[PDB]
């Protein structure tokens, strides 16, 4: 079981409407666990998972201070980038960052992340070697040469290999149980027809966590990849997810098709068919 601790940060300039909007969201194994939002009179880092309420006021105070420090730095960065791209001060612009660490089941670093984007596009990223940067355009080359000269990469490598890992281990101790939770899908097949010689069988999976799941339809042995309609997995809004997969089949041949639901909360994959009770 590998694990990760990552922070997703957003700064959006709002010329004429106030100060930039600033957001930090922290994730342990892709599960949101803290959040800072600048849109408040006294913005504070907040717990987003009940197992984080164990942390004392010192922790929260320090996180809040850092967030406020990052907010100011991003306010400067937004201005710098207007210059690099020679853009007007009247436009809204976005800087995004993904920063953090994933470690193996042994607790050691597998990957360090530090990726920046400007207006939804790659700007600059720390390579997997944790020593060099990839710049995506001419503007990012300025940042790159600056950071190389000042040896920023090695300072950042230290944080990622040390502090990041250490905090991840701490957060896992308090939240591991919660993070390992699984809700298995309840599945069923619905049947739809307009006045025509075909029908639609829709295989549904509901109330499941985590989001990762696979649905297939089988005719005979073979899976029907090309013919299926699929929707993206989506939140029910209560912490669980939904998905469905559907196939158009000949009228009267419903019982030749089988739906399969694969999910880690299932001891064995579910198999099911259209089943009219009357």
């Amino acid at each position: 079981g590998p694990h990760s601790l990552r922070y997703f940060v957003t700064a959006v300039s709002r010329p004429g409407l106030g100060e930039p909007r600033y957001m930090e969201v922290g994730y342990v194994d892709d599960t949101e666990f803290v959040r800072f939002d600048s849109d408040a009179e006294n913005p504070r880092y907040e717990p987003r998972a009940r197992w984080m309420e164990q942390e004392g006021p010192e922790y929260w105070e320090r996180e809040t201070q850092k967030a406020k420090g990052n907010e100011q730095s991003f306010r400067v960065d937004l201005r710098t980038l207007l210059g690099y791209y020679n853009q007007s001060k009247g436009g809204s612009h976005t800087i995004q960052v993904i920063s953090g660490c994933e470690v193996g089941s042994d607790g050691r670093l597998l990957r360090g992340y530090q990726q920046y984007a400007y207006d939804g596009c790659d700007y600059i990223a720390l390579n997997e070697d944790l020593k060099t940067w990839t710049a995506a355009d001419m503007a990012a080359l300025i940042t790159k040469h600056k950071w190389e000269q000042a040896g920023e990469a090695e300072r950042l490598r230290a944080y990622l290999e040390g502090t990041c890992v250490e905090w991840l281990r701490r957060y896992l101790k308090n939240g591991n149980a919660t993070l390992l939770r699984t809700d298995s899908p309840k599945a069923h097949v619905t049947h739809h027809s307009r006045p025509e010689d075909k029908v639609t069988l829709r295989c549904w999976a509901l109330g499941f966590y985590p989001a990762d799941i696979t649905l297939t339809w089988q005719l005979n042995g073979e899976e029907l990849i090309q013919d299926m309609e699929l929707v993206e997995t989506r939140p029910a809004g209560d912490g669980t997810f939904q998905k469905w997969a559907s196939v158009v089949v000949p009228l009267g041949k419903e019982q030749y098709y089988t739906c399969h639901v694969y999910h880690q909360g299932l001891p064995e994959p579910l198999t099911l068919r259209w089943e009219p009770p009357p």
Binding site: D77, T143, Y159
Partner: peptide, 9 residues
Amino acid sequence: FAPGNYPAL
């Protein structure tokens, strides 16, 4: 640990 103090772009 967020953390703070990233270098300027």
